[PDB]
Amino acid sequence: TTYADFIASGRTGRRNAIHD
Amino acid sequence: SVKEFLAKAKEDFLKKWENPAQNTAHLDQFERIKTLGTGSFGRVMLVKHMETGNHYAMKILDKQKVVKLKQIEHTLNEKRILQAVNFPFLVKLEFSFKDNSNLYMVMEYAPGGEMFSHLRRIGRFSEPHARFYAAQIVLTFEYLHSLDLIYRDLKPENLMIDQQGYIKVTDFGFAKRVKGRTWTLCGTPEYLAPEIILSKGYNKAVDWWALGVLIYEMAAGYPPFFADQPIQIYEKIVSGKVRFPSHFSSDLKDLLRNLLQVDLTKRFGNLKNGVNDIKNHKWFATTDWIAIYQRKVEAPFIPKFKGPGDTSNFDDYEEEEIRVSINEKCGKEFSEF
Numbered sequence: 215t216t217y218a219d220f221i222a223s224g225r226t227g228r229r230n231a232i233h234d
Numbered sequence: 235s236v237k238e239f240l241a242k243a244k245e246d247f248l249k250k251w252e253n254p255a256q257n258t259a260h261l262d263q264f265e266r267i268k269t270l271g272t273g274s275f276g277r278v279m280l281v282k283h284m285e286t287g288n289h290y291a292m293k294i295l296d297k298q299k300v301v302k303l304k305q306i307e308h309t310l311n312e313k314r315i316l317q318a319v320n321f322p323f324l325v326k327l328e329f330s331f332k333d334n335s336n337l338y339m340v341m342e343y344a345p346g347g348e349m350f351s352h353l354r355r356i357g358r359f360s361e362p363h364a365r366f367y368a369a370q371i372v373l374t375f376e377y378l379h380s381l382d383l384i385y386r387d388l389k390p391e392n393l394m395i396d397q398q399g400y401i402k403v404t405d406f407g408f409a410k411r412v413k414g415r416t417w418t419l420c421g422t423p424e425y426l427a428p429e430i431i432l433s434k435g436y437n438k439a440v441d442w443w444a445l446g447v448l449i450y451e452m453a454a455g456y457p458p459f460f461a462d463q464p465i466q467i468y469e470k471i472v473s474g475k476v477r478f479p480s481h482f483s484s485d486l487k488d489l490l491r492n493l494l495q496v497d498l499t500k501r502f503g504n505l506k507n508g509v510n511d512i513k514n515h516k517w518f519a520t521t522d523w524i525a526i527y528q529r530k531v532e533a534p535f536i537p538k539f540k541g542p543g544d545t546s547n548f549d550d551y552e553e554e555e556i557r558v559s560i561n562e563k564c565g566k567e568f569s570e571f
């Protein structure tokens with residue numbers, strides 16, 4: 215599932231901003 | 235009337251914009267309690283104003299780190315804008331000051347924590363729950379855009395929940411007052427509009443794209459474009475393709491198709507009728523925009539606050555001693571702060 219793929223991904227934590 | 239309200243709001247904003255408040259407190263007027271959040275060049279701490287006993291959220295920015303990361307102008311923007319604005323869903327900037335090492339912005343404390351924390355924990359919000367939050371963002375962007383401000387960092391990490399369960403937008407680090415178009419590549423990968431990525435100049439319409447990403451993430455529990463690396467995210471964003479969960483309503487999907495619209499002449503919020511295309515969309519049919527603004531709608535949930543300085547709705551962070559050098563750093567760069 216898409217949910218499963220998200221949770222297994224490395225970007226479920228706080229996301230850093232870019233600038234660059 | 236609306237026009238009368240926004241005209242007065244611009245008058246108020248322009249006075250403060252042209253004559254910003256400066257040096258309105260000192261570090262020794264606050265007791266530092268606990269870190270509430272962190273960033274590449276600073277942190278936000280819960281503090282108590284020892285005189286009044288009021289609690290605030292004090293952003294502490296290391297001046298040398300700001301310079302090193304080339305965020306001087308962005309930081310000056312943040313403070314100049316935030317001290318000038320006034321809206322129920324914007325965090326208030328109560329005081330600002332600087333010393334030899336750091337910049338300080340003392341903001342209203344939001345004891346409910348970040349939307350991000352609640353969203354991740356429960357998984358996803360119901361559509362009515364998401365709609366309630368979305369409506370507050372629509373009004374906030376209407377207000378900001380009328381002042382020629384672009385926000386440029388919408389995401390759940392930047393949306394605080396107050397004691398009443400309503401939103402307070404914070405993190406004005408990338409906010410900018412611009413009448414034409416701008417070019418800085420900044421924001422968060424998942425939330426970048428295609429025009430930012432394709433490096434062709436952009437305007438306030440990127441905020442409405444970001445609103446689409448936020449509504450999707452709130453309702454789905456994950457964002458419309460994600461991958462392991464930013465490069466893969468960017469490829470999905472520009473593709474013009476979005477997949478919706480099967481539980482999304484027809485109205486929600488139609489709204490998102492019009493917000494997550496790659497073409498600027500077709501994106502909601504950027505058409506002739508402006509924000510009204512969003513406000514009048516079927517997905518918002520049940521939204522009483524006036525009651526939202528007046529905070530008369532019961533929130534999907536209220537955070538229990540067992541004290542004025544309770545931080546149970548925040549994660550725990552590595553604490554660090556606030557070091558202040560006996561020598562002034564980066565004086566010229568931050569002169570107007």
Ligand SMILES: O=C(c1ccc(Br)s1)[C@H]1CNC[C@@H]1c1ccc2c(=O)[nH]cnc2c1
Pocket residue numbers: 270271272273274275276277278291293325341342343344345348391392393394404405
């Ligand atoms: O810690 C934070 C930082 C931002 C930049 C630095 Br390089 S560090 C912010 C980030 N996302 C919300 C977080 C934050 C946390 C709590 C509050 C609060 O209670 N009131 C006002 N603003 C807040 C901001």
